[PDB]
Short mmCIF file of C-alpha atoms in Angstrom, two decimals:
data_model
loop_
_atom_site.label_atom_id
_atom_site.label_comp_id
_atom_site.label_asym_id
_atom_site.label_seq_id
_atom_site.Cartn_x
_atom_site.Cartn_y
_atom_site.Cartn_z
CA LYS A 1234 -20.48 6.70 14.78
CA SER A 1235 -16.55 5.91 15.57
CA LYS A 1236 -13.69 8.51 16.39
CA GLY A 1237 -11.83 6.82 13.49
CA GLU A 1238 -14.74 6.94 11.06
CA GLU A 1239 -15.58 10.45 11.63
CA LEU A 1240 -11.80 11.36 10.54
CA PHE A 1241 -12.42 9.83 7.24
CA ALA A 1242 -16.27 11.35 6.37
CA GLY A 1243 -14.64 13.69 4.15
CA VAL A 1244 -11.58 14.25 1.68
CA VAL A 1245 -8.61 13.50 3.49
CA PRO A 1246 -5.19 14.97 2.16
CA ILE A 1247 -2.59 12.42 1.97
CA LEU A 1248 1.58 12.77 2.17
CA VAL A 1249 3.70 9.48 1.49
CA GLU A 1250 7.33 9.43 2.20
CA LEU A 1251 9.45 6.39 1.32
CA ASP A 1252 12.90 5.77 1.86
CA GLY A 1253 14.24 2.46 0.11
CA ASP A 1254 17.45 0.48 -0.70
CA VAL A 1255 17.18 -2.42 -3.09
CA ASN A 1256 20.28 -4.30 -4.02
CA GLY A 1257 22.44 -1.30 -2.47
CA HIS A 1258 20.48 1.25 -4.89
CA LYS A 1259 18.95 3.82 -2.68
CA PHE A 1260 16.17 6.03 -3.49
CA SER A 1261 13.41 8.01 -2.00
CA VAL A 1262 9.61 8.47 -3.47
CA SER A 1263 7.34 11.36 -2.08
CA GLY A 1264 3.78 11.33 -2.90
CA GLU A 1265 0.87 13.79 -2.58
CA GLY A 1266 -3.06 13.30 -3.09
CA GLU A 1267 -6.08 12.65 -1.31
CA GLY A 1268 -8.57 9.83 -0.04
CA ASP A 1269 -12.44 9.84 0.08
CA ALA A 1270 -13.08 6.87 2.30
CA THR A 1271 -16.60 7.22 1.35
CA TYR A 1272 -16.23 6.12 -1.84
CA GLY A 1273 -13.22 3.91 -1.16
CA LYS A 1274 -10.98 6.38 -3.64
CA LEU A 1275 -7.61 7.33 -3.63
CA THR A 1276 -5.62 9.51 -5.99
CA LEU A 1277 -2.16 10.28 -5.54
CA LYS A 1278 0.93 11.22 -7.64
CA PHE A 1279 4.23 9.87 -6.74
CA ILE A 1280 7.72 11.45 -7.64
CA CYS A 1281 10.98 9.72 -7.33
CA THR A 1282 12.95 12.45 -5.90
CA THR A 1283 16.16 10.95 -6.11
CA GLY A 1284 16.44 10.56 -9.86
CA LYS A 1285 15.69 7.22 -11.71
CA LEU A 1286 13.74 4.66 -9.74
CA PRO A 1287 15.95 1.48 -9.77
CA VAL A 1288 13.05 -0.87 -9.41
CA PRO A 1289 9.63 -0.44 -11.42
CA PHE A 1290 7.23 1.93 -9.99
CA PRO A 1291 4.23 -0.85 -9.95
CA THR A 1292 6.32 -3.21 -7.68
CA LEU A 1293 6.16 -0.24 -5.08
CA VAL A 1294 2.21 0.08 -5.03
CA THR A 1295 1.30 -2.04 -2.20
CA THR A 1296 3.88 -0.27 0.00
CA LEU A 1297 3.08 3.32 -1.10
CA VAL A 1298 -3.14 3.49 3.32
CA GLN A 1299 -5.89 1.16 3.54
CA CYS A 1300 -7.63 3.48 6.12
CA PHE A 1301 -9.13 4.77 2.92
CA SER A 1302 -10.94 1.58 1.82
CA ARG A 1303 -14.65 1.59 1.75
CA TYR A 1304 -16.32 -0.62 4.55
CA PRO A 1305 -19.98 -0.68 3.54
CA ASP A 1306 -22.45 -0.17 6.64
CA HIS A 1307 -22.88 -3.64 7.48
CA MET A 1308 -19.01 -4.12 7.74
CA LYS A 1309 -18.06 -1.08 9.79
CA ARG A 1310 -17.43 -3.20 12.94
CA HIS A 1311 -14.59 -4.56 10.94
CA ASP A 1312 -12.46 -1.67 9.96
CA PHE A 1313 -9.50 -1.97 11.83
CA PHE A 1314 -7.73 0.59 10.07
CA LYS A 1315 -9.71 3.61 10.78
CA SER A 1316 -10.02 2.37 14.68
CA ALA A 1317 -6.70 2.78 15.03
CA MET A 1318 -6.90 6.63 14.08
CA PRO A 1319 -5.40 9.26 14.42
CA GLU A 1320 -2.51 7.68 16.65
CA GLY A 1321 -2.24 5.10 13.68
CA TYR A 1322 -0.86 1.86 12.92
CA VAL A 1323 2.37 0.23 12.02
CA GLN A 1324 2.23 -1.82 8.92
CA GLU A 1325 4.53 -4.33 8.20
CA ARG A 1326 5.18 -6.48 5.09
CA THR A 1327 7.41 -8.92 3.50
CA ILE A 1328 7.13 -8.83 -0.18
CA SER A 1329 8.53 -12.24 -1.99
CA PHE A 1330 9.29 -11.87 -5.70
CA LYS A 1331 9.06 -15.29 -7.18
CA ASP A 1332 12.49 -16.47 -8.62
CA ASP A 1333 13.92 -13.38 -7.42
CA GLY A 1334 14.35 -11.05 -4.42
CA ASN A 1335 12.36 -9.73 -1.54
CA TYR A 1336 11.16 -6.32 -0.22
CA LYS A 1337 10.84 -5.73 3.73
CA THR A 1338 9.01 -2.95 4.58
CA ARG A 1339 8.00 -0.93 7.95
CA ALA A 1340 5.50 1.86 7.54
CA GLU A 1341 3.71 4.26 10.22
CA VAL A 1342 0.82 5.50 8.89
CA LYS A 1343 -1.01 8.10 11.17
CA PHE A 1344 -2.29 11.88 11.18
CA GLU A 1345 -0.19 14.55 11.44
CA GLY A 1346 -2.53 17.58 11.69
CA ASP A 1347 -5.17 17.35 8.97
CA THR A 1348 -3.14 15.03 7.09
CA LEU A 1349 -3.03 11.32 6.73
CA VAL A 1350 0.70 10.27 6.66
CA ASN A 1351 2.39 7.21 5.44
CA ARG A 1352 5.88 7.20 6.12
CA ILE A 1353 7.73 4.11 4.99
CA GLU A 1354 11.23 2.23 5.16
CA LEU A 1355 12.12 -0.45 2.32
CA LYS A 1356 14.67 -2.59 2.24
CA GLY A 1357 15.43 -5.03 -1.02
CA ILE A 1358 17.69 -7.99 -1.25
CA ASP A 1359 18.38 -10.90 -3.36
CA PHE A 1360 17.51 -9.45 -6.77
CA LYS A 1361 18.88 -10.56 -10.06
CA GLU A 1362 20.26 -7.85 -12.07
CA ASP A 1363 18.89 -9.35 -15.55
CA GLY A 1364 15.42 -10.18 -13.45
CA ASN A 1365 12.17 -8.64 -13.95
CA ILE A 1366 12.55 -6.03 -11.39
CA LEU A 1367 15.96 -4.86 -11.43
CA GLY A 1368 15.93 -5.23 -15.21
CA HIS A 1369 12.71 -3.13 -15.38
CA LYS A 1370 10.82 -5.81 -17.23
CA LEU A 1371 7.20 -5.04 -16.04
CA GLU A 1372 4.30 -3.45 -17.71
CA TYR A 1373 2.94 -0.26 -16.27
CA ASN A 1374 -0.17 -1.23 -15.37
CA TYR A 1375 -1.72 -3.06 -12.60
CA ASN A 1376 -4.26 -5.80 -11.91
CA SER A 1377 -7.20 -6.01 -9.39
CA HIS A 1378 -6.49 -7.98 -6.55
CA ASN A 1379 -8.27 -9.24 -3.02
CA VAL A 1380 -6.43 -8.61 0.05
CA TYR A 1381 -7.26 -11.40 2.71
CA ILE A 1382 -7.83 -9.60 6.10
CA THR A 1383 -7.52 -11.68 9.49
CA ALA A 1384 -7.64 -10.63 13.13
CA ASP A 1385 -4.38 -11.17 15.32
CA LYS A 1386 -5.90 -11.08 18.78
CA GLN A 1387 -2.37 -11.51 20.26
CA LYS A 1388 -1.04 -8.24 18.81
CA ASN A 1389 -4.46 -6.20 18.99
CA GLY A 1390 -4.11 -6.04 15.34
CA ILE A 1391 -4.41 -7.82 11.94
CA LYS A 1392 -2.49 -10.00 9.54
CA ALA A 1393 -3.20 -10.11 5.67
CA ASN A 1394 -2.18 -12.52 2.87
CA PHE A 1395 -2.29 -12.13 -0.86
CA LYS A 1396 -0.44 -12.67 -4.11
CA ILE A 1397 0.15 -9.51 -6.63
CA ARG A 1398 0.26 -10.45 -10.18
CA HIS A 1399 2.60 -8.06 -12.18
CA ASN A 1400 2.30 -8.34 -15.96
CA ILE A 1401 5.57 -9.00 -17.88
CA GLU A 1402 6.25 -7.58 -21.11
CA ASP A 1403 6.63 -11.30 -22.38
CA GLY A 1404 3.27 -12.16 -21.55
CA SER A 1405 4.23 -14.06 -18.15
CA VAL A 1406 3.31 -12.95 -14.90
CA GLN A 1407 5.85 -11.77 -11.91
CA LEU A 1408 4.15 -13.06 -8.83
CA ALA A 1409 4.87 -10.95 -5.66
CA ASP A 1410 3.42 -12.93 -2.17
CA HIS A 1411 2.99 -10.38 0.26
CA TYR A 1412 2.66 -11.22 4.03
CA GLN A 1413 1.47 -8.18 5.95
CA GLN A 1414 0.97 -7.22 9.91
CA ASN A 1415 -0.53 -4.39 11.25
CA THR A 1416 -0.72 -3.09 15.11
CA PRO A 1417 -1.99 -0.06 16.43
CA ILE A 1418 0.65 2.60 17.54
CA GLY A 1419 -1.82 3.82 20.61
CA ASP A 1420 -3.32 1.60 23.29
CA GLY A 1421 -6.74 2.85 22.84
CA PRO A 1422 -9.35 0.36 21.58
CA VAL A 1423 -9.51 -0.89 18.11
CA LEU A 1424 -11.78 -3.16 16.07
CA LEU A 1425 -10.49 -6.62 15.59
CA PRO A 1426 -12.28 -7.98 12.23
CA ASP A 1427 -13.67 -10.96 11.25
CA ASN A 1428 -12.26 -12.43 8.14
CA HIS A 1429 -12.71 -10.44 5.24
CA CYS A 1430 -11.41 -9.21 1.99
CA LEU A 1431 -10.55 -5.62 0.37
CA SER A 1432 -11.47 -5.64 -3.07
CA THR A 1433 -8.89 -3.42 -4.68
CA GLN A 1434 -8.57 -2.02 -8.22
CA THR A 1435 -5.88 0.49 -9.26
CA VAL A 1436 -5.19 2.64 -12.39
CA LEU A 1437 -1.61 3.75 -13.25
CA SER A 1438 -0.90 6.54 -15.53
CA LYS A 1439 1.64 9.50 -15.97
CA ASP A 1440 1.56 13.23 -16.16
CA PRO A 1441 3.05 14.13 -19.84
CA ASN A 1442 4.38 17.32 -18.60
CA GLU A 1443 6.38 15.60 -15.62
CA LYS A 1444 10.09 14.97 -16.72
CA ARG A 1445 10.84 13.32 -13.36
CA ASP A 1446 10.36 9.49 -12.80
CA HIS A 1447 6.55 9.45 -11.54
CA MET A 1448 3.44 7.35 -11.14
CA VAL A 1449 -0.10 8.79 -11.05
CA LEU A 1450 -2.48 6.37 -9.16
CA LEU A 1451 -5.74 6.15 -8.92
CA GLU A 1452 -7.33 3.52 -6.74
CA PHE A 1453 -11.03 2.22 -5.50
CA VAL A 1454 -11.29 -0.23 -2.72
CA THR A 1455 -14.28 -1.84 -0.78
CA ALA A 1456 -14.49 -4.14 1.88
CA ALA A 1457 -16.33 -7.50 1.09
CA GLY A 1458 -17.66 -10.15 3.27
CA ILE A 1459 -16.42 -12.47 0.91
#
């Protein structure tokens, strides 16, 4: 049993902190909850702490801890994310919304004490003011997706590629292309995986008594040799 695996054998508290700027509109999001990697399960509530969120909350889901994925027994040697812990890893993305702008993100995810922390900076540019994003034209829901993971031996890390489909109010879909790189923060050994996918399902809801702009999230993720 790996050092990293052991850290995730039980329920782990999670803190997420996001600092964003999209087309000059600045915002912060704070998240609190817990993860149970044994079940590939995340439960979190995110709050926009700067008032009204200038983008749709679903566009921030991928940015807002893949170390909580369930890796089946036969796939544990492919779990790069837990192998990097507790020192953690840097996770960077470019998220390109088709016919619209893009996010660039850089996050560090690591333990601070007993708490798994995801600290993110996000910059968004080239968005259309009457687009699906700044115009808030996305449905408040989320589709199931496969995240395809490949090793990046050069950087002692991984890369991932996937396309998120955001349901649009008119029946269309807003595509968000993700290109992702993860690299270890520490210089101890990590697990470099064979190609595989993370099958992820997420359910978005609201607290009817929460008056702040917010997002309640439940997520199930399991690795598949697929």
